[PDB]
Amino acid sequence: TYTVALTGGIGSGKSTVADEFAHLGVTVIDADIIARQVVEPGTPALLAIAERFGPQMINDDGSLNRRRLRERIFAHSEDKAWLNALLHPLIQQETRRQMQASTSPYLLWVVPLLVENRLTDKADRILVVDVPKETQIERTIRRDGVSREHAEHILAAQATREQRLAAADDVIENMGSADAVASHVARLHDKYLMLASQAAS
Numbered sequence: 001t002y003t004v005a006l007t008g009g010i011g012s013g014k015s016t017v018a019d020e021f022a023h024l025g026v027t028v029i030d031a032d033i034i035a036r037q038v039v040e041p042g043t044p045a046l047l048a049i050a051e052r053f054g055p056q057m058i059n060d061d062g063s064l065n066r067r068r069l070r071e072r073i074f075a076h077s078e079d080k081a082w083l084n085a086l087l088h089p090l091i092q093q094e095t096r097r098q099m100q101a102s103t104s105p106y107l108l109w110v111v112p113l114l115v116e117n118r119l120t121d122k123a124d125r126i127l128v129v130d131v132p133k134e135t136q137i138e139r140t141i142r143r144d145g146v147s148r149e150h151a152e153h154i155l156a157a158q159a160t161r162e163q164r165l166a167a168a169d170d171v172i173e174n175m176g177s178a179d180a181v182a183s184h185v186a187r188l189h190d191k192y193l194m195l196a197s198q199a200a201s
């Protein structure tokens with residue numbers, strides 16, 4: 001299936017823009033979403049986490065206490081492999097289920113490290129969500145509760161803005177009025193529908 005890879009630096013708006021494509025009926029594949037899905041309240045993988053590490057892994061609302069799990073892996077690095085062995089097969093399986101169940105003309109794949117992991121060849125098109133550096137910093141501080149200096153260290157561990165823009169086929173700036181960003185998404189959606197038809201012919 002025709003595939004558009006959505007990338008962008010931390011805090012630029014990958015999740016936000018992907019939701020607007022979803023609203024237009026596009027199947028959105030996002031491994032970070034799938035990872036949360038596989039440990040939702042009541043899931044066997046959440047039970048396995050709690051049975052191993054303790055009931056303190058489950059919040060009063062039945063959800064995974066993510067901080068407590070991060071604390072466990074921080075204290076016991078060997079438990080990272082255990083967690084991977086539990087979750088990786090479930091994430092792969094759910095990724096494939098979502099691909100197979102899709103009936104949309106194209107797929108949107110949210111790929112945070114597309115440039116950093118050299119995956120530019122896998123998708124038919126690359127869409128970069130862009131914002132100024134100061135905007136990434138401000139939005140990451142607010143969402144994630146990190147210092148500005150911490151945000152700068154994350155940016156320094158990611159591809160540069162210039163590198164992402166150089167790899168992009170299309171750029172969406174997640175700035176200005178939200179209505180205009182959504183209209184930009186609708187314009188790109190039409191472009192992708194037409195490219196998907198061209199590829200299918």
Ligand SMILES: Nc1ncnc2c1ncn2[C@@H]1O[C@H](COP(=O)(O)OP(=O)(O)O)[C@@H](O)[C@H]1O
Nearest residue numbers: 008009010011012013014015016139143174175
């Ligand atoms: N146009 C905007 N103006 C201000 N904040 C925004 C805007 N778009 C998204 N946000 C917020 O910015 C943060 C990062 O957006 P998100 O889509 O999660 O980025 P990413 O997935 O690229 O890390 C979130 O807290 C989100 O609510």
